[PDB]
Structure formats: structure tokens, C-alpha cells
Amino acid sequence: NFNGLTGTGVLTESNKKFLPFQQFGRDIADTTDAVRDPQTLEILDITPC
């Protein structure tokens, strides 16, 4: 759970670059696939288990 974003999956270092106001990303078909850690400000991918 990332401040409201509830889900399940494996967290891994990403290679995306958000804009300096965006918290999380979605893929095509509108499903969350990356988030930013509120504390460390790093982008992490979410893959299904």
C-alpha cells in the first residue's frame, strides 16, 4: 500500500522518468504498473506474481 494505492506484486527498480508532479504510472488499458516511494522518491515497477 503506497498512501492509498492498494495492490499485490513484486517491486523492482524501474527505468521510467515521471514528471516532477506525478506519483504513479499506468500502462495501456489503464492498470497501475509503477509507483514512486513517498519517502525515497524512487520509481519502482510492479510486476504480477
Partner 1 sequence: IGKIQDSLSALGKLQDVVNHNAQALNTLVKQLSSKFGAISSVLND
Q: Beta-strand (E) ranges in the chain?
A: 10-13, 24-26, 32-36, 43-47
Binding-site size, partner 1 (CB under 8 A): 3
Could you say which residues in the range 12-41 bind partner 1, by CB under 8 A?
29-30
Q: Cα separation of 39 and 49, whole Å?
A: 25
Shortest distance (Å) from residue 22 CB to partner 1: 20
Nearer Cβ to partner 1, position 15 or 47? 47
Round to whole Å and give the CA distance between 42 and 49: 21
The binding site for partner 1 (CB under 8 A) comprises 6, 29-30
